[PDB]
Ligand binder design. Sequence first.
Ligand SMILES: O=c1ccn([C@@H]2O[C@H](COP(=O)(O)OP(=O)(O)O)[C@@H](O)[C@H]2O)c(=O)[nH]1
Ligand SMILES: *[C@@H]1O[C@H](CO)[C@@H](O)[C@H](O)[C@H]1NC(C)=O
Lengths: 11, 698
Amino acid sequence: PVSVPYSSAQS
Amino acid sequence: SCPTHADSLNNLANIKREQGNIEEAVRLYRKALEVFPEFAAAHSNLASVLQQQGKLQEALMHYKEAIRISPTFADAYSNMGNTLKEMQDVQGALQCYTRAIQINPAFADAHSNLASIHKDSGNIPEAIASYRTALKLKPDFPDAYCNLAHCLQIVCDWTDYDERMKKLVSIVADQLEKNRLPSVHPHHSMLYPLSHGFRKAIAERHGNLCLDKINVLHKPPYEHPKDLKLSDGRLRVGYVSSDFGNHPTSHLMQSIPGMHNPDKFEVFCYALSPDDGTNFRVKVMAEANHFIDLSQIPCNGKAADRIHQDGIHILVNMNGYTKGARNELFALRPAPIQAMWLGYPGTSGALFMDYIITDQETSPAEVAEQYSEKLAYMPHTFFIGDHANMFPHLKKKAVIDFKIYDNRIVLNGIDLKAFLDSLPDVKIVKMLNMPVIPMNTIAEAVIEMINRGQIQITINGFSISNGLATTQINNKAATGEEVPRTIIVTTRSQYGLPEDAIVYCNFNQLYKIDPSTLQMWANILKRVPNSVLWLLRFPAVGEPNIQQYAQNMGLPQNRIIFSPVAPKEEHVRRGQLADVCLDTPLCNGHTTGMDVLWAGTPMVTMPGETLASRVAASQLTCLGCLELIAKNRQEYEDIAVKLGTDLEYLKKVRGKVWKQRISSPLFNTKQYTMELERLYLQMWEHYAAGNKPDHMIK
Ligand SMILES: O=c1ccn([C@@H]2O[C@H](COP(=O)(O)OP(=O)(O)O)[C@@H](O)[C@H]2O)c(=O)[nH]1
Ligand SMILES: *[C@@H]1O[C@H](CO)[C@@H](O)[C@H](O)[C@H]1NC(C)=O
């Protein structure tokens, strides 16, 4: 259950 | 008509490109194509520099031509895919990569490109398989290898780890020195053993990417303001983020634009992202002096103008090398002073960034050469968070005694006070202090609601919500967008935690863990015989991997307990159930750090050299808890173990964190803002006095 946005790569 | 002429031209242009001279290369290719229009390879080449210059729309048309002319050109498809990928048309990119593979199954690049799409989509397992294939097909393949390596990192696959690290470094070293754009990404750089020298270089080349992309705009340098005359004495500060909306950035700083002193400051927020609906976006829009949506203005030229236009003195880059970033804007240098802040934990390594806003702990002067920017120090920590505003129902708690623990069964609620007063028997442990509900029938109902798995109950008219059903009772509460209007019960039993254990937690995404980190934790748990480690399936596919290595370190499976990822508010609130957080020393919990501290849950950290690894230390320091800061592996484990076994101590420390998290400056955004303001002034003085950016260590 659930997905939260987080800090990530880019490419 | 002449192919031999056209052929020659091509060769030269290739050369011109070798010596980085894109300018000229392009001119030659276009001439080649004028001599020979049906020239496949020309089209292709030209395409890929147009791509590099960011002329996608056109670059694309060329690849189209190349393919039409030479339909067995696997290579062209694959690059055209990349173009489409960068154009946000994932759909079409996908088609290209697959056609490439089908036309030539042996073609390693397309496999890798495919893997990339998967990777960006979240599907890591498929990303891996595709990388592995690419690698099998072409074993010397840096982009493949490095991406794969990060996938493995993310799911904690640690096969051959040590030797993988060596290879990464070795590949970077090679790439850098052969002047080729390095395969590790600046953001990831922070995770592998590279010299600060290297990390910086990486950031550097990635910065240059923006240069190429703005150079073809041929824009004259901007005229920068020199006084606050035109802006009526107010310094004009531009915040640029693709994260104004529901994303960690906003969960830290949403309050800040609002808290700037209008007498001396005029705040401009430049969204790089469309309004996602959430109250985060609402609030920043409501509170900034000017809110400016740049996702409207795809062209960097136009957007850069629009900034300059607004007459910004200081432009703040909340993005670094993360998703959504548009550093081209910074590369265009629309404002006199341009500072990295908050959003990205590393150097930009780029000439267009003047300062990086940090602090003495996070970036002591010893390690200042990590960064290409000059250091601008905030006084305590440069980190900040909205918890005080977002989550004020966790300012106070109460517990229930079912036998006296602060973290076994917990209630928080804005009206909690009011409710306890309707109660008969509330004893009140001192420290404010913690009310304790005795085992009434009340206590029973509540605990029964929890056990029956019910949504919520009523007691003397107050709603008592099961803190697992927050999204069902009010999704706005669950996400942080609202403060809950109920009283919420949180319990170890909800997450299958032992009612009588030491719970050590770490809520970071698992890629922050490496072998040695797990190692340390293993030792702690062995030395604290009655304890468990609490972790997040983040991603789930990582759990069996940890569990695996956990057991070769000789820990029965049941010593580590995984929970699912949860909605922002539940995630924060359930941190109250833990005894101690154990911070990843490879990359500290950043937001995650603040969340754990807000719950009042001491955190034990082991600061390294990279900014990213010293943030928890910095936070703890500002909070006032140096006894949580280890100088090495040894000290870390001891601090852990002491808090694990010496219950007296633990009670003391936990009580401290809990009190300090109010009384210290850490979670105080008003103070933070004011600091940030002086620091801004400092920077401006110094520029307006006519100097070049220099370290602001106050
Ligand atoms: O179960 C969870 C675990 C984490 N988070 C959030 O996920 C983000 C973590 O992203 P990241 O690890 O990039 O943050 P860092 O700690 O590195 O700042 C933050 O909003 C956390 O509060 C969440 O909402 N639920
Ligand atoms: C994730 O995001 C928050 C806000 O952008 C940031 O402060 C933090 O440094 C980021 N975490 C990582 C691991 O980059």
